[PDB]
């Protein structure tokens, strides 16, 4: 049961890392575009 | 036992991805601020 619970919790961690990576990809892309546009 | 060991190792991997995401959030934020300040 502890092992199932750990995987459940680790999926939530992975979902949060995915959210953060997507935020950062969009923000680095906006900066790259800003510098191209300047 | 292999399954417990895999989750232990995968937690260490998740901790390293978290470290890297935090480094990148701080560095993209510093760049955004630098460009705002220019």
């Amino acid at each position: 049961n502890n092992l199932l619970r750990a995987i459940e919790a680790q999926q939530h961690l992975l979902q949060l890392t995915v959210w953060g990576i997507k935020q950062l990809q969009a923000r680095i892309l906006a900066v790259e575009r800003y510098l191209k546009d300047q | 036992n292999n399954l417990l060991r895999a989750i232990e190792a995968q937690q260490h991997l998740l901790q390293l991805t978290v470290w890297g995401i935090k480094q990148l959030q701080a560095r993209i934020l510093a760049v955004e601020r630098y460009l705002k300040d220019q």
């Binding site: 919790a9 939530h12 949060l16 959210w19 | 937690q11």
Partner: peptide, 23 residues
Amino acid sequence: XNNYTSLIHSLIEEMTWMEWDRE
């Protein structure tokens, strides 16, 4: 991240960026 990380430690032994850090 801290909340889930703490839980997993215990189990294995046995949106904003502030909230992201907490979870």
